[PDB]
């Protein structure tokens, strides 16, 4: 299988060879390989999507197809590689973005192939190659994505092995990456466990940690549209994405109108105190989160606690305190609690507890510039969406490019090609200021 | 003593308090505190400089005074904090540079107070505070710099403790910083030992590793000016700075002219094979580098092996192979070997071995754009100076700002305020595109 | 008198000589001359201000002193001159901002010395010199400013005649500028008559035309603060500035609260229908605008129609239709009509008529992002201030730099040094891309 | 015929209607219409090219096809429309690029359809429409291009009349454009006569004046490659383009080698003093330039003075003084004199006379950074190409985008969408700085 290897040392070596050609390739040559990856991704997004659902049991196909199309269209390519110039009496100074080399990447089972392909477009654009240690739940999907990219590069004249992976990811294979001297950067896209581990590797780690994104709704909001956007956003790929709304905080005065709209127009099903407890018991085990529930549609989750509901039901909503464990905990499930709030200031405090100091993602619906500003300042997230669904944050219905590696922990924010370069200052003294 | 504390947990706590005021300070308020730090630095550069020489035994006062003046003048302040905007049908998207929080910093005995103050200007500009664990050889100097900054902030209305330090740095106090949960970023300015250690901390580490900067001189160079620039650059603060030229590679045809110029006009003293061996024996011990020699002027080093020379001698030069240990090893001494080369291509290969894969700093004298380009591409350093002394790389006689934390390992290059921020995307959907 | 000449051909020649030195001056040399102009301006703003009031009869001293301090502090200098770089396989391409040469400038009697000095800072920063043909009402003031700048440049090592003027401006002297072959650019800061004339000169004309800036206030606005900001803005330097609010459009529901606040807290005096007609008769003559009224404080204007009012009265307000000639006409007087509006959409239409297709300046008080966006899009002005006084538009209490030459007609917007340069592309083929 | 009208007032009105839809179109909608124009241009470049040659008698088809493909590929679209943001304590300030409206354009018979289409892509990207008054020699070609664009916009959902023209251009129809109140900007791409006329119109004129681009070759140049590049560049589309090399200045020592290479490898034919005089008599008439010679290939021009030469001859070269009228005069003919020069400084002086103060285009072959810098500074052109053919200046084999409207006179340089917008500052006070 193309770009896939029996072990990590082989993956890294192959990748290191290809990178010697990649660092000397023009922008035009890289952009061709990248253009063919975009094309290959679109052509196979149906295959990639059903693979992920079939292998992991999570998410759904129509949303995963859109995810893959967003990656192909809006992931930055070589236009993201830029140069700055200062010139004056003392000459010209240039600052460039040079390659790192072979980058290691650790990728999730939620957006497995989206991450792999987004990372590669970016990383390749900057003259890097990349070696993946994919989540073992999504290994087939992941290595299919890898094989696609090499197909795409083979199509565009080469080289082979711009992206490599291993046939069987383990912890041993990931330990070998993180102590490999040929690898100076690792991008970690995953939970806190893996991110922490890369920032202990002795290499620079770009760390995409977790979150619990709240969405604030105040009384100035368009409430009908707020309902629509929040469910759309929460339920996207069955709540798998890190950015998706996972709990609401509603100003008291409009909280009934919002929730009403949610039931009556957005396919929401309000559960009783009783039903809340059996669902909590289901989705939160003594072992932590229920892997069998993560990324499951709401009809399926309701069905699992013996509640039969119409096929047009797509989200479980209820009103609860912020400590409610379906509210305080990141579930990656179309399960959305509403937390009622006395005041905007109380709303901000509740939202901030709920975000859990992650400074990952948070959302607001308000038409009031002071309100937005207040919330923005206090919540201090890598991402803030105002009056749209969360996925606007990655260019689905909002300005800006797509990524799947949001580096909230180590601070690079929404990663692109430029993230994965080294800065190089070039000082041409006392010449080449033409003024 | 102001900003200085008995232990690291106290340092960090004080710093964390001040940062709560700093993150809500305007740019104008930060820039005032920064303006007063610049002023305080200039007023006390004579004191800072003689302190460093007196405490460490290294460098010299006139050059250290200039180093401090460069920091005050050319370290970026709040103008380095920038914002990007994308607007279109789907609204306005902003990307901002938000504070990290309390940054930890580990600083050297070579440019102790320069680093402390440069870091602080940058870090403060971005809404951070900073806690230092200074090199223990330069603790007095370092903590004097710290106390100055708090004086400067006290002068500008507060707050106290924007920069903190410890009375007695140790390895215990640095371990406490690197495992402190209140600290998400550490800037490490030092050798590979300390940098490696911060990249194992579980936090993002900005890593300023070591080097061995070569300077290539070809036959198109202005040779008389190349002589002048290289000695000036090599001998600056007795070769302490990471960037300074520490070995030459000369195209054979002009190597005699260069070296001749060096002796006859630049205060160089050519040593014999005999004298080379006693100096190697002196400056390289079974314990590694001779701490008693590092940063010593050439008259002093010559004197230590019983060679008496006129006061106008400032650099030891000789012709040798690249493996010669005064040539291959970073000495931080005004000791500069010349390596003769058949051809430009041979010159590039020699220079590349000598740089030792650090991708730190390298230099060239050539008037030929293809030559410069060839060398630049192959040497791939964070810094490349063409036809000037190395310190042009930090704005002394070259375009661009000053830093003392050149992050060659982790890839941020010449650090400034913007380095020490987190990126924040703000998506204002379907409003505030005024076009 | 320094920089001032008997005739325009002499002015231009002297300016052309100085420019030969200016185009070869470093940024540091220009910035020194500029730094001394900033300093000289502050030191003499009291003199400049009382000169203008005393010579023209217009405005007031305290506000003119602040105007001059804004120019000194916030007019961009040589940091406004920037360079862009594109590098790739085909080499390096630079784009620079090169000088025009000798720029001609035509300046107003409202902000005479502010314009002269702002233009010069900018123009000098870019390697130009400048020749002024000052408004004849403010010739003394204007040529004093000129003489100051040459004093400032003399102080900083030269050259003399970076700014020149004529002892006696006329129409003949301005015709000679506009047909002078040594002058490729003219900046026209004045009414439509002079701007039109420069755009007929055969040279590039940068055209700062007139306006009638409306300020919209809706029901979401902070009304008490809206009152404060609008009077402060309208009455600044007795309404002389082009940007200042000159009429209000108020959403009906809060129009009484706004106007009430204006009378009770902002020193406003509401006039009756009767009093409106005698003031209209006063300030609008068969000859057009009453030169004896322009830039007069409200107590003085009220007094002129025999209405005695307390010294604490600073603005004349009344409610009227938009066609009311104190509302529809730019008066440059602290005379501010309020136009009541059924709805936001009606408010936008009224404001748009009132702006008169100038696309100059307009203002809004609203906390609603859709409202702001709607208004912004429809009014389409070079300048839009939201929830502040108009002078925020030039950095008094708002982000961004200062100018006094707002080129609304020819489209360059708020002029700075970069405006007054020529773009130069430099294509270095197949070299100096170091990546 | 689509977008073409019987008279100019109709053209302008139709254009003004379409622009009301264009100013409210998203970037995505504009970029679709633009994408279809790019596609339509490529599909019909063979038709456009042979039309121009057949109608004007000038240039050649293979080069015109490449010209059209460069326009389609490298003319900037809506990515050229950008936004700047400043945020701080006082809020957020945005600067946008808003539409002008209906732009008038005057276009040449040399690159008729290239100009029309390049202008339109740019102008449309910024929310403008455009009305053309095409050169009457190339009216069919020009109006075919116009009709294509409307075809392209019709294909992409509309609107019709984004570009308009007249069936029969005259001076009356161009006078009506230049005095039309619905038109605030005119782009003039043509000789000095038309540019001067637009800068007398009372509107902002963007003025693309003429030139005489010299190419300097010194002794450090790659001479064989210099020969190749200069002929390729000079002879491109039979020397029609404004940018093309039209005379050489050669350092004496390598001038024979260059010229030798030109004859022996580049299809050059050296003419005698005798033959020079009959060609001068041919191509320069008492009426000025010979319209029957402009843009004719060298075999044809040689043939016209009775000199029969092989089909492989593409350029007429000779050695002459700089005043030689085939050297000093812009001919737009593959006629290239070599001017021999004592020294680089003499070479620079000769080149500068030859450029004739146009500050249009100039070229150099030198590997020496000080040489390039010296020449660049003294020649001060909108365009400078180093070591490539001139057409690198527009992205054929050099970094940067394509244009056909190089505004050398009025200073905007290489025009793109951003040129044809008005700047708009938006000051959001004391809100929407999220930091």
Author numbering:
A (entry chain A), B (entry chain A), C (entry chain A), D (entry chain A): 28 to 462
What does the report in the manuscript say about this coordinate set?
Here, we study the kinetics and substrate specificity of an AldDH enzyme from the Clostridium phytofermentans fucose/rhamnose utilisation BMC, Cphy1178. The overall structure corresponds to other members in the aldehyde dehydrogenase family, with a catalytic domain (residues 238–427, highlighted pink), a cofactor-binding domain with the Rossman-fold type nucleotide binding architecture (residues 28–108, 127–237, and 428–447, highlighted grey), and an oligomerisation domain (residues 109–126 and 448–462, highlighted green). The catalytic and nucleotide binding domains come together to form an extended nucleotide and ligand-binding tunnel that is open at both ends, with the catalytic cysteine (C269) at the centre of the tunnel and the NAD+ cofactor binding at one side. Cphy1178 forms a tetrameric quaternary structure generated by crystal symmetry, with molecules related by D2 symmetry.
The structures of Cphy1178 were also solved with mutations in active site residues, C269A with bound CoA (1.77 Å resolution) and H387A (2.08 Å resolution) to ensure that mutation of these residues did not destabilise the structure of the protein. Both of these proteins display essentially identical structures to the wild-type protein. Mutagenesis of a strictly conserved Histidine residue (H387), that is within 2.5 Å of the catalytic cysteine completely abolishes activity of the enzyme. This residue is not found in any of the non-acylating aldehyde dehydrogenase enzymes. The proximity of this residue to the catalytic cysteine is incompatible with the formation of the correct geometry for deprotonation of water for resolution of the acyl-intermediate to produce a carboxylic acid product. In light of our biochemical data showing that the H387A mutant is inactive, we suggest that this residue acts as a base to activate the catalytic cysteine and to stabilise the acyl-transfer intermediate between the enzyme and CoA cofactor. In our reaction scheme H387 deprotonates the catalytic cysteine to allow nucleophilic attack on the substrate to form tetrahedral intermediate.
